[PDB]
């Protein structure tokens, strides 16, 4: 596709809707939108392999890691291909997000199409952490909000 | 994939789980769950166009329908792709879903992963009304309840 959205919800407060534009076949994709109802501060953003809400956000599974190398930034050639790093909620609890990112893709084989968009309670250590687990998840910890990513018009 | 998942909420009470399975890339789609709350008798049941829930099911948009052809049954030779005609809810509002299909599927063209499965307020006429709302939407009305679909295996 060449648009994409995610509606955000969870069992708390945290909502919001993220879209998703690539105007060209596995070229850049533009993540953008707004997410509501955060602590203030740096709070983890990835795409998880399942767009399973079965059981919430948890049957999301693991970060979408199709090329099978390690948690890390957007920013890292070692990353999952779900790895958006941190948004930034504001004093009011508002994450205006807007990211670029060409390593997630709207087609082909890593395309995020109904897969799971998940805002975390705390913030992504991008796998600089001092322990094992940084490496797999950044201990970003709970899974505040998330949303199906479906084909926009 | 070979397994897709959506879980439908409304703004009523109708809720339900419903399951895709495809085993070959061009066999059958296998169709499984069910939905409650809903009224007893005939309700629609279609893959929408948008998998998206910015507003509600509203805006999953029209059926899904890559080539424009005209609403109906899911074993007329005419249809959307995304007509599954009715689930049938029982005294206690129960609908148990086995369904079959060869039009809609899990990759391609007929994908439906990231699009819209919607349960409907009245019964889907089978495109067979002498008017041209049932050659569009069988008549099935207002949207109870609808959810992204997306991968799940
Ligand atoms: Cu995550
Ligand atoms: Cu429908
Ligand atoms: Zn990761
Ligand atoms: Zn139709």
Redesign the pocket.
């Known amino acids: 596709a060449t648009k994409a959205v995610a509606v955000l919800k969870g069992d708390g407060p945290v909502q919001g809707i993220i879209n998703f534009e690539q105007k060209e076949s596995n070229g850049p994709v533009k993540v953008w939108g707004s997410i509501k109802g955060l602590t203030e501060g740096l709070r983890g953003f990835?795409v998880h392999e399942f767009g399973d809400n079965t059981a919430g956000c948890t049957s999301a599974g693991p970060?979408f890691?199709p090329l099978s190398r390690k948690?890390?930034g957007p920013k890292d050639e070692e990353?999952?291909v779900?790895?958006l790093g941190n948004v930034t909620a504001d004093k009011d609890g508002v994450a205006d997000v807007s990211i670029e990112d060409s390593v997630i893709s709207l087609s082909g084989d890593h395309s995020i199409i109904g897969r799971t968009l998940v805002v975390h309670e705390k913030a992504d250590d991008l796998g600089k952490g001092g322990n094992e687990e940084s490496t797999?998840?950044?201990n970003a910890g709970s899974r505040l909000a998330c949303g199906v990513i479906g084909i926009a018009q």
């Open positions: 990835h970060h890691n948690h890390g990353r999952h779900g790895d797999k998840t950044g």
